[PDB]
Design a binder for this molecule. Structure first.
Ligand SMILES: CO[C@H](C(=O)O)c1c(C)nc2ccc(Br)cc2c1-c1ccc(Cl)cc1
Ligand SMILES: CO[C@H](C(=O)O)c1c(C)nc2ccc(Br)cc2c1-c1ccc(Cl)cc1
Lengths: 140, 140
């Protein structure tokens, strides 16, 4: 599985929208609570993600997510292409587990991302260790 | 220079606040436009950063930035310690250069972060390549 492949989806919780990007080869996650499922939020999230990792292609489970000119302009600019688990259920589990530790869901979501990315898998490395290892190896 | 060291500061542009985190050993940047310079925004940004990279210690040029219980609770939770260029001027340059390409400053800022992190330095690697190389080497 290519190191440049990400999957991006939205989930709903507490009337709010959680955008979840998963680095496919590693299981590493970035996520953000957005006010609305909009082309503009998606484009913005893509720019942010691409500035941080070498994002080559993005997949989704809802293709209509990527049809706005706003989104296609963000991929154009960042040089991203499209195509055309669930680690989303596990993230939601974690969120429920830490939910009480924070007032705002947005805070709980970042706690859950932290926990997911740092958890030793294979009982081995964490997803946070695997992404860095995968991308460095691909560089050299 | 230890791989776990980050510097975090706020700048002002267009009446808005830009929080800038710099990975010291590599020059890699993460940044975000926040509505207000608040303990809560800083804590939230720290949680997000720590979920993504192995953040051990954070430095700042304004120590009072880190005195709220809100912020100290985020470091406590994420296991971050404190202490007690400018690549901020260069980021501001980039921002001015792409400013016209976007309506919202927040969008321009992410474009500038992208450009900064992908630029081949030493004419060599980009900051995005160096951080991954530094952190992977430190893992193995
Ligand atoms: C960053 O937003 C937090 C939240 O959504 O609950 C928040 C907020 C909004 N207010 C706080 C006030 C005092 C203290 Br002590 C901690 C917080 C916290 C807080 C909650 C959990 C952590 Cl790990 C760090 C800070
Ligand atoms: C994401 O927020 C953008 C901005 O701050 O200017 C935005 C916004 C807010 N609206 C757009 C509407 C149509 C088209 Br085409 C592009 C955009 C864009 C846009 C601007 C630049 C890029 Cl690279 C991608 C999208």
């Amino acid at each position: 599985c290519s190191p440049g492949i990400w999957q991006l989806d939205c989930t709903h919780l507490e009337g709010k929208v959680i955008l979840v990007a998963v680095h496919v080869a590693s299981g590493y996650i970035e996520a953000e609570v957005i006010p609305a499922e909009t082309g503009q939020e998606t484009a913005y999230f893509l720019l942010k993600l691409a500035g941080r990792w070498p994002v080559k292609t993005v997949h989704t489970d809802n293709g209509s997510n990527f049809t706005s000119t706003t989104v296609k302009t963000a991929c154009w600019w960042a040089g991203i292409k499209q195509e055309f688990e669930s680690m989303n259920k596990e993230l939601k589990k974690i969120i429920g587990q830490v939910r009480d530790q924070a007032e705002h869901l947005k805070t709980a979501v970042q706690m859950a991302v932290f926990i997911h990315n740092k958890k030793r898998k294979g009982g081995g490395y964490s997803a946070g260790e695997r992404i860095v290892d995968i991308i460095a190896t691909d560089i050299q």
